[PDB]
Structure 1
Amino acid sequence: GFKQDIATIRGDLRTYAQDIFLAFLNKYPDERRYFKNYVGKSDQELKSMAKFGDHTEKVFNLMMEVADRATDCVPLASDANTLVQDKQHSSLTTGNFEKLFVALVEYMRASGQSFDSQSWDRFGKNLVSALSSAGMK
């Protein structure tokens, strides 16, 4: 279930973080231009970049924290607010986050692993709603 998935993802955090983030940029190429140092690089070129590994680790580390603090796949309003008030995410709309979770849920289904994809779908949707409520457009 959801709680086991957080353990699975944490167990190989860099590998999952990089793969899902890559699935996200490739499915939604417009989102690549938010990350200027990732423009014009192939999957393996990005995986050879130290800063890509580091960034993706930190993102999925935080996502797992929010997921672990969540009750029944609903994240904390203060966790949502953190994402909304952050300098780096100030010029985003909830649409960017929705796309990340589509790519994440798709990835889970296409993998061979027994991920609880429906719980991650709910989690994504509840996070998006919590982002709107905190003032994200």
Structure 2
Amino acid sequence: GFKQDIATIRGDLRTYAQDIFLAFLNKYPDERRNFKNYVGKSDQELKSMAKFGDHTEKVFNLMMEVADRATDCVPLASDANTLVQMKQHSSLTTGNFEKLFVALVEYMRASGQSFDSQSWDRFGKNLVSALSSAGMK
């Protein structure tokens, strides 16, 4: 289920983080334009850039912390607060996050593995509503 998926992802975090983030950028090319340094790079070129690996891993680490602190795929209000308040996130709307979760769920469904896709979809929806409640546009 959702809790095991957290353990699966954490076990090979940089690999999942990279593959899911690439899926996101490839499914929504306009989102790439928010990442100036990733414009004009293939998947394999990105996977050779230090900040790409680092940043995707740090993003997914925080995702997994929020996922683990959630109850029944409902994240803590305080965690939503953090994601809204981050300087790095002042440009964002909730649509950016919805898109990331759509790509994430589609990745999980396509994979050979027994991810609880439905729970991640619901976690995504609940996080987007929590971000809105914490004041994201």
What TM-score do the two structures reach when normalised by structure 1? 0.99
Q: Distance in 2 between matches of 1:41 and 1:60?
A: 21
Q: Distance in 1 between matches of 2:91 and 2:66?
A: 21
> Matched residues, percent identical?
99
Please tell me the root mean square deviation across aligned C-alpha atoms, in Å.
Answer: 0.5
Q: Distance in 1 between matches of 2:86 and 2:53?
A: 21
- CA offset at residue 100 of structure 1? 0.2
- CA offset at residue 86 of structure 1? 0.9
- CA offset at residue 50 of structure 1? 1.2
- CA offset at residue 34 of structure 1? 1.1
- Deviant stretches of 4+, over 4 Å: none
- CA offset at residue 91 of structure 1? 1.4
- CA offset at residue 124 of structure 1? 0.1
- CA offset at residue 99 of structure 1? 0.1
- CA offset at residue 33 of structure 1? 1.2
Q: Distance in 2 between matches of 1:112 and 1:42?
A: 24
Instruction: State how 1:1-137 maps to structure 2 within 5 Å.
Output: 1-137=1-137
Q: Distance in 1 between matches of 2:71 and 2:48?
A: 37
What TM-score do the two structures reach when normalised by structure 2? 0.99
Q: Distance in 1 between matches of 2:84 and 2:58?
A: 17
Specify the SS of the correspondent of 1:25: helix
Q: Distance in 2 between matches of 1:101 and 1:128?
A: 9
Q: Distance in 2 between matches of 1:12 and 1:77?
A: 28
Gaps of 5+ in 1: none
Q: Distance in 2 between matches of 1:117 and 1:34?
A: 27
Which deviations, in whole Å up to 9, do the C-alpha atoms of 1:17-40 show, x marking residues without a partner?
Answer: 000000000000010011111111
Q: Distance in 2 between matches of 1:131 and 1:117?
A: 21
